[PDB]
Each structure stands twice: as C-alpha cells, then as structure tokens.
Design a protein around this ligand. Structure first.
Ligand code: ADP
Ligand code: ADP
Ligand code: ADP
Ligand code: MG
Ligand code: MG
Ligand code: MG
Lengths: 525, 532, 520
C-alpha cells in the first residue's frame, strides 16, 4: 500500500535521466559542437558572423570568442566553452583545435560503450595513450636559437600561425611588428613578458598597410589652447599629479573674513600662488608639462604666454607609460621638480586625420624604452577587432616560444606520428586496454582529415599516402599540403608550431574526455 | 531521439511500480481473510451501499485502471468462476510470490532461472498434495460434509448459526442431485430458488421441499389453493389472434366483416377450450395474457400465471416431468392437446410473505426440487446471506465431486514449505534460491491469519515449523501433520478429527493460477503508453 | 459544530506511516547508491539559477537534493554529522541504515514490538564497536618513516574512488607534508586553496610559505622591481593616502597664513609617516587598508614594493609563515615585528599575476595551487584534497588503521551470526538480519564494478567460516585477495562513527508512529 507521496519540493516539475541515455546525449552534443566548430580550422577556413543581443555584429575567426558568444543552455556545451576559455587563457593559440580533438575522442568512445567496455577502462586507456604520446612528442623536438640578432625563426613562426585570419595581406609586416614589440618588452633575466606595457589603439580610417608601430606613447587628447605649437623638436616631459588649482585640504575647513584687509590679502594670494607655481615650473627649464587634472583660465593663459605647452585630461595609464618610455619620474607637488625627475623627449607632434576634428598627440624618438604602442588602422570596426585579435595571438605565440625556446614540426605530421607511436605501443599491451589506444590514435588523425576536407582534396587517400611515406622513410615531417605547393614536406614550407602548447591541448582534451565519461546523470528543474 | 510521443520506462522503474501495485492490491483485500476478518463496504456516487467480503466482488467494484492490477482482478474473476471459493488467497499468494521474486531479480539474477525454479516448486507442491489426501467416503461421510459447510460459512455473517445452514445446504444438495449416465455422481448447482424477503430473522428461514415462483396470480377471481393439480407448461402468447405483415385484409362484402371479427375472438376461445379439455388447473405462460382470456380460467376454476421466466418454467417442467409445448401442432394438420404431457403437483398454496406474495409449489411425482428463502434485515444482509449460501453450495459440490478432503489452515502451507526446503538440497544449480523463495512465500497465510487475530505471529509460526519438522522426520510421530491453526485461543489442536475440512481442488488450482500469473507478469520490463 | 484541530491537518496511523517512511528512505538511498567504490560515477545537480554541481561525495548530493520530507531528513542529518566528524564515509552510513530498515520492514509488517528492535540494534552496535576495538591491532612504537608510509597509504586509499585516482601517488606526499607542517593544534584555516584557470592536473605544486592574488594597483606599480634577494616584510594596518584626520573634525582657519601652514603640515605629516615606514629597513609593505597613489609613487623611488587591499586570512597566513606581527601604529617599527624570507618572485601563472613567498625555514603553513578544469573540476579537486587532509588528520590522532574493502563487514557479520546462534528466542532473528544486512557492502561494490556478486560473496563467506581474516574484494584481478597486504588501510574512526550514526538514525526512525502536519 504505497500511495504517491512527495519527497522533493519540485518533484512533479523535474526530469530524471539515468543509464547510458545521458552519456549518449552528451556524446551527441559533443559531436554536434565539433561539427559546428569544424569548418573554422585551417588556412582555407572561413569566418563566423556573430549577432549580439543588442544588435551588434561581430565577425571573427577565433574559436574561443565564438564559443563564448553563443549563450547556449546545455551543460556539455558550457563545459566545452569553459575548456576553450581555459585553453585560450593558458596558451593563447589553437582554441578551435582542442574542441575538435575532444569531440573526435568522444565520438570514437561511443562504439566501446555499445560493444561492452567499462568507461573507467576507456578513461584509463585514453590517459595511458595521452601519456605515451606526450613522452614520444618530446623526442622529435628541435631547439632553435632565439636572440636579438637573428629573428628568422620567430618571424617564420609568426607568419605560419597567422595564415588563416583576414589579416594575411601584410603577413611579414605584422610578424615583424610583433617580434619588434617582443624584443622591446622581453625581460630576458626573468623569462617572462608583461602585456600591461604594450598598448593597442585602434581607430577608423586608413588601410591595413598603414599599421606601422610607434616607439613611444600615444594619447587620444590634444593641447588645451589652439594657439599652442603642435610639433616640437627639443622638449622635456614633466609629468605632474597635482592640478593647477590653489591648495585645499581634504578635511573640513572654513575661512572667515572680517575686515577689508583679509579680503585684500586673499585676493592678492589668489594670484600670488599662481605666479609662484608658474615661476617654480619655469625654473626647472622644462619644455612640456603634463598634469593629471585639467586647467582653469589664468593658468592656461600664463602657460601660453610663457611658451609652455601642456596636455589636459591625462591621468590614466598614459602617465606611467610615458614615465617608463621617456624615463621621467612622477612628482607629487611643485617643489620637488627641479631635481632629476624629468623626461627627455624627441618628437612630440600632434597628428591629424580626415575631415573630423579628431586630434591625437604622439611621442617618438626616445632612448632605451621598455614600452611600445601599436596604432591599428582599417576601414571597419570588425577589421580592427580582427587585427587586434591576430596581434594578441601572435604576441602569445612569441611569448610561448620565448618560454619554451624549442619547437617541433606541425601541420599534418605530428598527429600522424603520435597515432603511429600509439598503435605501435598498443601491440604490446594485451590486457583489454588495446581497444582504447586504437580509438585514441584514430581520434588524433582528425586534424589532417579536416584539413584535407577544407582544402578540397581526398582526406583518406592523402592520409594513407602520408602514412605510407612516413613509414617508408625516416622523416617525421611530411604533412598535408593545404596551399597546393606540390611538396608535402613541412620543413621546406617553414611550418613551425609549438610543442608545449600542443602538449597542454592534448592533456586538457584527455582530462575533459575523462571527466565527461564519468558523468551519467542529470537533474534539472 | 526515438519519436514515440508517449511516456516510457526502461529498467527498475516499471518493476518497482508493478511491485507497489501488487502490494497495494494485496493490502486492500487483506482485512477479510479468515474467519477473524470482518466485512467491507462499497458506496457508489448516488448513495447505494454494498456490503460484501467475498473477494471477487471487491475487486470487481473498485474501478481499477492499472494493467498490473487488472491482471490480478481478471485472475480472481476466473478463479471465482471456475471453482467458486478461494478468491483472495490466490491473489495474496501471487502477490507474495511476486514480492519474493522481485528481490531475486534485483540481486543480479536472470528471471528465467527464477521462473524455472518456481515452476519446479509448483510441480513438487502439486505432486506432494496428492500424498496427503483423506477419502470422505472411507470415514463417516455425513459428518464431513457438515464440517466442510461450516468451514465454508465460517468467515461470513452466519458464522455462529452454521449448524442449521450446513444441514440445509446438505439437504438441498441431496435433493438437487440429477440422474444421467449413472457413472459419476453429478451435483449441479444454480437450480434452487433463492428468494430475498425481509421480515423474520435467520432461524425462521426453513427449507421448502419444492420449487418457488416469484409471481402472483392473474385475476382476483382465481383460487389460491388447489390440491392435486396439473401443471401445464406453455411457451406462446395467449392473446387475440393477429395476422402477419404480409397478409392483409381487403373487405369487399359487408356481410362478412362481422363474421371475421367474431371469428378473430372465437379462435382464441376454441384454443382455450381445447387446451382445458384435459382438465388442467395450473397454467404457466411466459408471455402476456389478455383480460378476455382470464374470464375463461376464472369461470373454469383454474389458475393462470403470466410473465414467467424461461429458466423457472424449464426447471418446473423438469421437476414435474412435463414438456414445454411451444405450439399445439402435432404429426398431422390439426391442433390437438393430449393428457400424457401434463404435470402432477401435490399442493399449490400462494402464501403471503411480507406484503408481497409468491406462489409455492411442493414436490411432484417425477423428480424432487428444493428452494431456500433467506430472510434478512434490510437488503445488504439478504445479499450477503445469498452469497454465503452460494459459496457453501459450490464448496459442497466441489467436495462431492473431488471425493477427498484436506485439513485446511496453517498446516498445508507449512508442510509444503518444509517439503520445498528439504528438496532444495538436491537441486545444486541456480534454482536453489527460487525454491526457498517459493517455500517462504507460502508462509504468508499463517502470518496474515495471526495478524488479523491480533495475537503472537512469530512464536506461533516457529511452533508450527518445529512441529512440522518433528512430524516429517521420525516415522513414529507421523500423526502431528494434522495440527492446523486455532485462532480462537492461539494454540495447535486437532484439525483432522473435528477441525477444518477443505477440498483438494481449491489449493492446487489456486497455486497453479498464481504461478502462471507470476510467470506472465515477471516477464515484463518495458511499458509504452501512447497519447490519446 | 466546531472541529478540533485547524482545517488542513493531516494524520495517519502507525503501520502505513512506517511503510511510507521506509519507502522514502529507500528512494533517498537509491539516489546515492551507485556512488561508492572506485568504479562508481558522480552525479550532476542543477538548481534554479542554472549552475551545475558535479561532485562525487554524497554529502553535497544530499545537500543539493532539497528534500522537504519530515522522515527523509534523518539521512541528511547523519550524513552532515559524519562529514563534520571524520569526513569520509558519508554514503556508507546511509546505505547501512537503508539496509537495516529494509531488513526490519518484514519484521515490522509481521507484528513485532519496536522496543525489542531498538534494543537489538543497540546490542548489535555495542557488540560491533567492541569487536572493532578488539581487532584494532595498532602499533606500539614505530619510526617516523613507518608513520609517513602509513599516512601516504591512507591518503592513496582515500583518494582512490575520487576523480584524481590516476594521480593518487602525487597528492599523498603533498598532503602528508601539509599536515606535518601544521604544529599540534591542526588549524584548517591556515591552508589556502587557490584556483587559477589554465594548466594541467599534473602541473600542481605546493609552496612552503604563502601566496595570494594580486589586488588593485595604481600608476606606480610598474616602476618598481618585483624581485628581491633577502627582503623584509612589514605587516601594517593603517591607510596610506591623502585624507582627513577625523570625520568629526572642524578647522576654523583665519587668513591665508594659517591655510598655507595647514597645507604644509598635512604634507609634512605624510612625509614623516612615509619616512618612519621606510626607516624600518623593509622592502615589502602589506596592509589591509587600500594604499593611495602618493605612497605608491613614493615607494617606487627607493626600490621598495607595496601592496594594498590584503585580506585578513592572507595576512594571517603570511604572518604565521614568516613570524612577524600586525602593527597598526608606525611609531614602534623595530626588527622583531618584521618578516624574513630567502626568495621573493612575481611570475605570471595562467595570465594572472600572483605573488610568491617561500624560503623561510620557520614556516607553519602552506598554499595549494590546483589546476585542471575551470570550476567543477577545481571544486572536485579541492573537495578531494580536503577529504584527504581530514583523513590524514584523523589517522594521525588515531594511529590505528584497519583493512578496507569489505573484510571488516564480513568479520562483524560472522561474529554477529555466531553470537545469535547461541541465544535462543526472538533475539536470534533480529541479530541474524542485522548480520545479513552488513553483507550489502561487497554486493554493492561488485554491482558497481560490474562483476559477479553472488559467487564472490559465497567465496568470502566460505573463507571467513573456514578460518585468513583481512580478505576483501579485488577489482583488478576480478577475485579475492588480502586487503591488509595490498596497502589498503583506512582509519578506524570512520566505521565506528558511521555505525553509531546508522544505529541512532534507525532508533529515531523506528520509534515514530505518527506524523502531524500543520497548515501554512
Ligand atoms: N601554410 C600552412 N601549411 C601547413 N599547415 C598549415 C598552414 N597554415 C595552417 N596550417 C595548419 O592549420 C591549422 C589551423 O591553423 P590556424 O587556423 O591558422 O590557427 P589555429 O591553429 O589556432 O586554428 C594548424 O594546426 C596548422 O597546422
Ligand atoms: N474455522 C476455521 N478455523 C481455522 N482456519 C480457518 C477457519 N475458517 C477458515 N479458515 C482459514 O481462513 C482462510 C481464508 O478463508 P476465507 O476467509 O473463508 O476465504 P478464502 O477461502 O476465499 O480465502 C482459509 O485458507 C482457511 O484455511
Ligand atoms: N583501493 C581500494 N581497494 C579496496 N577497497 C577500496 C579501495 N578504494 C576504496 N575502497 C572501498 O570503497 C569504499 C568507498 O570509499 P570512499 O569512496 O573513499 O568513501 P565512501 O565510503 O564515503 O564512499 C570504502 O569502504 C573502501 O573500503
Ligand atoms: Mg591559430
Ligand atoms: Mg472461503
Ligand atoms: Mg570516503
């Protein structure tokens, strides 16, 4: 006698899915995600047009931002988006490949679930195959020289990593700009870089060829007076934080005026303080002062009469950027200024644009600077965003190269070699674990097949030909010719990829597959 | 995936639901098992009250919407239609077997081995039942039928007054025995008239030696007491003659319309005169009789009963040796009536029993009939008494047809459980646990009997098991197997000399039906319900 | 006529109420039934806000179930009690209670007194506790290497059914070194668990000091060197910014002379405070209150580091690692109130700036860096780390491990059966059912592993009756072996506590025959 009671507060409005149905649904969702994020892989892949909620159009090629801007609702899709975000935050390049690898690994595991294999054994075999591939990939790792003199391998790697986005017309120019920015902000004594010193500014107008770097700091302001000189040759930067106002404490103060003498003294001091501060600023012999706040009315006229240009409304990171580039020190008041707290300039000329009233001030020609700015030019906002994303990806790639100081042979040879090594190692493992290694090796070959499908050639035929050519000779560098050059050797085509990045991608994909193969229940309201 | 447009269940969800439904069905009818349990009450939506506790009626009037419970309902209905007694015990046994097999299924055991073990245990129990048999004709005989009828009427409303009811049932069965090929003693039931009339109590419900009719006399001028009368069975309407649809009347001569209208009424008069030419007194008609035809029977001093049922007329013609004549035609072309096919009753007295009257017919000269007029309080008591009488008649018929009796109670089930436990040591395969579960499922009848009696159940069960184990081994104590179960005090007694008597055809059939139901239900693990 | 109780009160009898309670307990236990051995799988709970919760521990699953049943809350209570006590067997006690309830359900339906059942449960629990305390067999005098090996084996056994089971040989030494450096009070609040996105699971490290996330910065954060050889950490708690002295102050300045005097005196006080802070010989300035832009630029001109908005727990951990003290006033900055370290770096991990402090030999705390997933994986790793830390802390204070798997349950069942085979009466059936209910642990393990449970249970029973005591189940060889020789140990405080909790839950559930619910 069991009447239908009530246990959960929302039992009548909740679904339950146990058994292998939840795992099958998760595998299907992962396969659908991998198929959706499949065409955006390789040099022949097209871009994706994203539509925002308010109505903004964003066309990009990076898989990380595409997956992030998709506000879905499934748990597997959210897990894949989080995995792609973590991969982009750790490495920076190859965000659309880890998801494809995870989908290919989860697709091949569906046959073992229907045949009669426990998911724990599948996860153990996948982890063993991933460890074997990681241990084998470090044997074919060639170390290249990286320094300030020879920059050919870095330029080649930056050009190879930037052959799929819309910013491919310059190629050599963007790679040179990136390697120059890296050599400027390198810090070889600690083997790390800082992205807070490299500022990227984008504006409408111009073309992609006019994206020349500027060895200095650029601001988006102008002079406070139109009758001031725009360009100067010999100027001394003087960055200050106190405004051009009379002193006033932040506490509660009240001034009392009794007779006419007090009012006269106050009226005299009102201009005496300004005259004293002007004389103190002029005594240091500076030629270009920089204040944090704005100016009033008498201070600007005094600075114009004394022939001393100044910049208004510049109290952000531009102060520290200029202090790092030129070499000056920030001062708190006006007394401590006549010492060695000034910055040497070289060319401070206010540039112009088209018919609009947009005036920007730039500072170039400096000494041993440790911060450079890149001025992006284009014809559309999406073009500027894509150029900024490509520059960030190139910077991350060069940072990984600096941190690793060694590369391998990418393209379509490393995955095939890893699959061959896994298949060879699986022949000496007779303990039911040979089925997972074969699936792991077959899932790793999804990159050359996708590349050949996106190029326009036969995938399986080219894969078999490359495998035969690699097993016949002793050159593990023959990949898939996506540019139709007639040579399948990736060494002559200067195809350089990262090793630690690929290792981290493989490890993250294996961990995600193991985590997915463990969940089999779902309870949603 | 899988576009079905309907709710489905795969796994342990449908099995648990079926187990819960079977448990609820068993617990619903678990308050009227044995002579200790009381009755039930079923009320509809208009105010009609129905008091019953037979088992099949409770499952029929309950509005069951689940298939797992509908299977048990139709099984109980088939069991009640077959034998007539033991409708709740079979359902309880089937529910206990299902609950015991669910635990084995949930223990990572294939249902095929469990089904095979259950079939083997059922076959062993059937083969062991024929060993413990007592011939009713080898002992006293007359004292066994009374005990069986008292046991069958021990869990009804007439539990105390069962001494006279048993004798009445025995007399009715002895008087209703028919004669056929004279090879096997056949005792057909559903042949007595069970009339329900309020008024007197239960001790004033005597047995009438003859057939009773639930009809009154036609006209008030007809007598109501004719001694040594003749019963005439007719099967045609005794009204005015009317032509068929394909036969019309076209009046072309006014000198013949009056003659035709006079003949249309004189034909019936001539037919009545030819029928009553042999000196008939009791005339039974199934159809309606016109008011003009009753005057002849009134003036002739005879009785004419109309609206008589076909079964009652057939039983009257069979008891009195008459022949129901559907027409007056013979082997020639003239309607003649003979006196060789007429009844011969003793005395027909129309006695008034509580406002309404009824015609009573005593025994004749061909065969002997019987009728039991039960008198209750209101309407539910009469229905309960009729149901108890029918159950007692069915039990007596089954006992007389089986020619054997088995002491019922908590003895046969315990003996079968002990025999199955002693037999599980020989089966060294995977069917060892199935026999144990089958033996443990049979011990649910004494548990329920002790629970309904509000007494100690575990101690009594242990004592019965110890007694059965002591009676099985050692041939010097083979007379301890007839202990039974006495719920009046809570101690074993003698259930063979003067205790509980039950036939052997009820236990075997119920056990086989419960096993078949458990087998046909345990093979279900996928439910698909389409949307209307 | 007026009714007794308010309109909307529900009541029932005893037998149907107990049957409903048993059914609810079975339904609740069936949810956390597949989560037990290493072959078990976790669940995924989604609340109303759309946030997923993936955890293998049964405590979080029972907490996220949101059960409003008045009788099903007994399992959650004992689960929380076990998680707060030893923090390990959260589902074992629930499974044992469900098995006891399912075993006593037929005895209750047959018509038995609940007081006798409660007395039998208490007697069986006392006998099991006595047997466990008798067959404990602990070491009397062992070396430090033996204790370290025992702790490592206990950590590996506790981290065998979690998600980090493939890397159980790496976290064991880490948790051992973390527990060994916790003095004697064993403070759990001094262990910082940081979760940084990026990296792999094997890239986790354990520093011997303190490490926190970089807070807010001004325009003077890039003009200072973030590396020092042997610096000095000065713990402060005063605000270093240009602000008023007191909120309830009023200055009645006369003419311009007093105004200029006050303006100069404010900067003089600021410079005097800065000089008094710098003259302490420190290089790293840490304070809970945010630091202004003036002090950030003043400290950058003398090769000094500063950081504001330091949390209280991070500051306490840094003080416990170094050896300084919280100095609110700057008028007493000596040498015994400053920190000391051997190395100080500032690297970038996962795109986020983090500060590292290590090298001090007198460190009494540490910091964990968990890498892997993004949120759910990191939470699972943190839960597994906390469970391993609790297991090691319990094994340190108990120093008495036993065989895992299912040997202790089989031994307890055999002892209970041997004790019941002597006493007659109705006390034999209850103890027999209690002993048979303890055999569900190996059956559940075999069902979760996908092996034959009947044959394994029969072989284990035969081996226990023919004895050859610490014999459990085996998942690799798909047979039976010695759990004590396979380095499978577990603390004895987990079985006794779970047994007592299950006995208390059974005594509280059985002794209930009425349920009254008030409206609203
Ligand atoms: N010129 C080329 N020759 C060979 N392989 C290439 C070439 N350009 C791109 N690829 C391959 O295409 C894949 C995708 O590269 P791309 O879309 O540019 O960036 P990401 O690797 O981040 O998707 C890379 O793994 C690379 O091996
Ligand atoms: N006088 C009696 N003494 C002992 N047991 C009895 C007695 N009458 C009936 N029983 C037992 O009670 C059980 C239930 O019988 P009953 O309630 O009449 O309906 P059914 O036979 O349809 O279950 C039977 O199995 C019988 O053994
Ligand atoms: N390596 C192992 N060998 C044998 N038994 C194990 C092993 N790891 C775990 N177990 C068993 O699995 C059971 C579950 O333990 P665990 O998952 O750590 O906590 P909980 O008991 O709360 O589920 C334990 O009772 C233990 O005996
Ligand atoms: Mg790329
Ligand atoms: Mg009966
Ligand atoms: Mg645990």
């Amino acid at each position: 006698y069991g009447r239908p009671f009530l246990i959960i507060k929302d039992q009548d409005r909740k679904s339950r899915l146990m058994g292998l149905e939840a795992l099958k649904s998760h595998i299907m969702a992962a396969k659908a995600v991998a198929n959706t994020m499949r065409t955006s892989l390789g040099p022949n892949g097209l871009d994706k047009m994203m539509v925002d909620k308010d109505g903004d159009v964003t066309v990009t090629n990076d898989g990380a931002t595409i997956l992030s801007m998709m506000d879905v609702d499934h748990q597997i899709a959210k897990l894949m988006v989080e995995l792609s975000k973590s991969q982009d935050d750790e490495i920076g390049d190859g965000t659309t490949g880890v998801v494809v690898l995870a989908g290919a690994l989860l697709e091949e595991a569906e046959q073992l679930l229907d045949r009669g294999i426990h998911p724990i054994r599948i996860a153990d075999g996948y982890e063993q195959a991933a460890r074997v591939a990681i241990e084998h990939l470090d044997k074919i790792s060639d170390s290249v020289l990286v320094d300030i003199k020879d920059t050919e391998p870095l330029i080649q790697t930056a050009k190879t990593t930037l052959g799929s986005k819309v910013v491919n017309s310059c190629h050599r120019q963007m790679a040179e700009i990136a390697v120059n920015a890296v050599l400027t902000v390198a810090d070889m004594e600690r083997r790390d870089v800082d992205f807070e010193l490299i500022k990227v500014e984008g504006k409408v107008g111009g073309r992609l060829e006019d994206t020349k770097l500027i060895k200095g700091v650029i601001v988006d302001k102008d002079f406070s007076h139109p009758q001031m000189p725009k360009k100067v040759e010999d100027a001394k930067i003087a960055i200050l934080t106190c405004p051009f106002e009379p002193p006033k404490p932040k506490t509660k103060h009240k001034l009392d005026v009794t007779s006419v003498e007090d009012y006269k003294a106050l009226q005299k001091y009102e201009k005496e303080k300004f005259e004293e501060m002007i004389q103190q600023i002029k005594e240091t012999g500076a030629n270009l002062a920089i204040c944090q706040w704005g100016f009033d009315d008498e201070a600007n006229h005094l600075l114009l009469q004394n022939n001393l240009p100044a910049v208004r409304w510049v109290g952000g990171p531009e102060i520290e950027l200029i202090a790092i580039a030129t070499g000056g020190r920030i001062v708190p008041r006006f007394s401590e200024l006549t010492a060695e707290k000034l910055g040497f300039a070289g060319l401070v000329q206010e540039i112009s644009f088209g018919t609009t009233k947009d005036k920007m001030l730039v500072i170039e020609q400096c000494k041993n600077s440790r911060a450079v700015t890149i001025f992006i030019r284009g014809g559309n906002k999406m073009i500027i965003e894509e150029a900024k994303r490509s520059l960030h990806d190139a910077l991350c790639v060069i940072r990984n190269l600096i941190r690793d100081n060694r590369v391998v042979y990418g393209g379509g040879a490393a995955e095939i070699s890893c699959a061959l090594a896994v298949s060879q190692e699986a022949d000496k493992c007779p303990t039911l674990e040979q089925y997972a290694m074969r699936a792991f090796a077959d899932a790793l070959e999804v990159i050359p097949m996708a590349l050949s499908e996106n190029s326009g050639m036969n995938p399986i035929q080219t894969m078999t030909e490359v495998r035969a050519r690699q097993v016949k000779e002793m050159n593990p560098a023959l990949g898939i010719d996506c540019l139709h050059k007639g040579t399948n050797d990736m060494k002559q085509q200067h195809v350089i990829e990262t090793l630690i990045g690929k290792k981290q991608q493989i490890s993250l994909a294996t961990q995600m597959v193991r985590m997915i193969l463990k969940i089999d229940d779902i309870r949603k309201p | 995936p899988l576009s079905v447009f309907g709710d489905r269940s795969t796994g342990e969800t449908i099995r648990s639901q079926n187990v819960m439904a079977a448990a609820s069905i068993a617990n619903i009818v678990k308050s009227s098992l044995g002579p200790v349990g009381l009755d039930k009450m079923l009320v509809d939506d208009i105010g009609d009250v129905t008091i019953t506790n037979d088992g099949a009626t409770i499952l029929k009037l309950l509005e069951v919407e689940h298939p797992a419970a509908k299977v048990l309902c139709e099984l109980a209905d088939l069991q009640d239609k077959e034998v007539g007694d033991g409708t709740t015990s079979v359902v309880i046994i089937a529910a206990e077997l299902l609950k015991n097999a669910d635990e084995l299924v949930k223990q990572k055991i294939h249902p095929t081995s469990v089904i095979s073990g259950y079939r083997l245990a059922c076959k062993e129990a059937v083969r062991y039942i024929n060993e413990n048999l007592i011939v009713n004709t080898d002992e006293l005989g007359r004292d066994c039928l009374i005990n069986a009828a008292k046991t069958s009427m021990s869990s009804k409303i007439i539990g105390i007054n069962g001494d006279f009811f048993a004798n009445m049932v025995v007399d009715a069965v002895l008087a209703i025995k028919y004669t056929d090929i004279r090879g096997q003693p056949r005792y057909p039931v559903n042949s007595v008239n069970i009339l329900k009339a309020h008024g007197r109590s239960q001790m004033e419900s005597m047995l009438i030696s003859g057939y009773a009719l639930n009809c009154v006399v036609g006209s008030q001028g007809m007598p109501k007491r004719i001694v040594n009368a003749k019963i005439a069975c007719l099967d045609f309407s005794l009204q005015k003659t009317k032509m068929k649809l394909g036969v019309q009347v076209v009046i072309t001569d006014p000198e013949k319309l009056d003659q035709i209208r006079q003949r249309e009424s004189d034909i019936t008069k001539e037919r009545i005169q030819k029928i009553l030419a042999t000196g008939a007194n009791v005339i039974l008609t199934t159809g309606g009789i016109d008011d003009m035809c009753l005057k002849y029977f009134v003036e002739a001093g005879a009785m004419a009963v109309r609206r008589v049922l076909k079964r009652d007329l057939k039983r009257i013609a069979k008891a009195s040796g008459a022949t129901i004549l559907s027409t007056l035609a013979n082997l020639e072309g003239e309607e003649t009536f003979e006196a060789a096919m007429l009844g011969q009753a003793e005395e027909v007295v129309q006695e008034r029993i509580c406002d309404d009257e009824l015609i009573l017919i005593k025994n004749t000269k061909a065969r002997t009939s019987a009728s039991i007029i039960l008198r209750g309080a209101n309407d539910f008591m009469c229905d309960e008494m009729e149901r108890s009488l029918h159950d007692a008649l069915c039990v007596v018929k089954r006992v007389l047809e089986s020619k054997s009796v088995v002491p019922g109670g908590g003895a046969v089930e315990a003996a079968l459980s002990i025999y199955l436990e002693n037999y599980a040591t020989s089966m060294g395969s995977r069917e060892q646990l199935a026999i144990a579960e089958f033996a443990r499922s049979l011990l649910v009848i004494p548990n329920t009997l002790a629970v309904n009696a509000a007494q100690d159940s575990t101690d009594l069960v242990a004592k019965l098991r110890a007694f059965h184990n002591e009676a099985q081994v050692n041939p010097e104590r083979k007379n301890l197997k007839w202990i039974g179960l006495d719920l009046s005090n809570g101690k074993p007694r003698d259930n063979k000399q003067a205790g509980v008597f039950e036939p052997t055809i009820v236990k075997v059939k119920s056990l086989k039906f419960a096993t078949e139901a458990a087998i046909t239900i345990l093979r279900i693990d996928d439910l698909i319900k389409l949307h209307p | 006529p007026v009714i007794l109780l308010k309109e909307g009160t529900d009541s029932s009898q005893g037998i149907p109420q107990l049957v409903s309670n048993i059914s609810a307990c079975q339904v609740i236990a069936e949810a956390v039934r597949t989560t037990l051995g290493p072959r078990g799988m976790d669940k995924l709970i989604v609340d109303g806000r759309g946030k997923a919760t993936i955890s293998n521990d049964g405590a979080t699953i029972l907490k996220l179930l949101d059960v409003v049943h008045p009788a099903a809350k007994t399992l959650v209570d004992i689960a929380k009690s076990q998680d707060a006590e030893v923090g390990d067997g959260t589902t074992s006690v629930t499974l044992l209670a469900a098995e006891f309830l399912k075993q006593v359900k037929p005895y209750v339906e047959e018509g038995l007194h609940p007081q006798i059942i409660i007395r039998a449960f208490r007697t069986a629990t006392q006998l099991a506790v006595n047997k466990i305390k008798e067959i404990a067999v602990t070491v009397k005098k062992a070396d430090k290497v033996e204790q370290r090996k025992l702790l490592e084996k206990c950590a590996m056994t506790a981290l065998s059914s979690k998600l980090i089971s493939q890397q159980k040989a790496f976290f064991a030494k880490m948790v051992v070194d973390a527990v060994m450096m916790l003095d004697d009070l064993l403070q759990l609040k001094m262990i910082g668990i940081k979760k940084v996105q990026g990296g792999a699971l094997e890239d986790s490290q354990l520093v011997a000091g303190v490490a926190f996330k970089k807070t807010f910065s001004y325009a003077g954060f890039e003009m200072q060197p973030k590396k020092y050889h042997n610096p000095k950490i000065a713990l402060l708690n005063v605000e270093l910014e240009l602000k008023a002295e007191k909120d309830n102050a009023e200055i009645r300045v006369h003419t311009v002379e007093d105004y200029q005097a006050i303006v100069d005196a404010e900067w003089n006080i600021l410079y005097d405070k800065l000089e008094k802070i710098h003259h302490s010989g420190a290089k790293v300035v840490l304070s809970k209150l945010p630091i202004g832009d003036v002090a950030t630029q003043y400290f950058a001109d003398r090769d000094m580091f500063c950081a504001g908005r330091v949390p209280e727990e991070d500051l306490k951990r840094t003080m416990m690692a170094c050896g300084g003290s919280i100095q609110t006033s700057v008028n007493a900055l000596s040498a015994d109130v400053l920190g000391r370290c051997q190395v100080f770096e500032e690297t970038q991990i996962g795109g986020e700036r983090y500060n590292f402090f290590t090298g001090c030999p007198k460190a009494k705390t540490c910091t964990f860096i968990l890498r892997g997933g993004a949120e759910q994986f990191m939470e699972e790793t943190e839960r597994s780390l906390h469970d391993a830390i609790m297991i090691v802390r319990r094994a340190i204070k108990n120093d008495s491990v036993v065989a895992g798997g299912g040997a202790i349950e089989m031994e307890l069942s055999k002892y209970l059966r041997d004790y019941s085979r002597t006493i007659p009466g109705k006390q034999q059936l209850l103890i027999g059912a209690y002993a048979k209910a303890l055999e569900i642990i190996p059956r559940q393990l075999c069902d979760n592993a996908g092996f034959d449970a009947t044959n394994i249970l029969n072989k284990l029973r035969a081996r226990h009756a023919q004895g050859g005591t610490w014999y459990g189940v085996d998942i690799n060889n798909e047979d039976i072996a010695d759990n004590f020789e396979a380095f499978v140990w577990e603390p004895a405080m987990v079985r006794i506590n779970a047994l007592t909790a299950a006995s208390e839950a059974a005594c509280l559930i059985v002794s209930v025959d009425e349920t009254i619910k008030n409206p609203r």
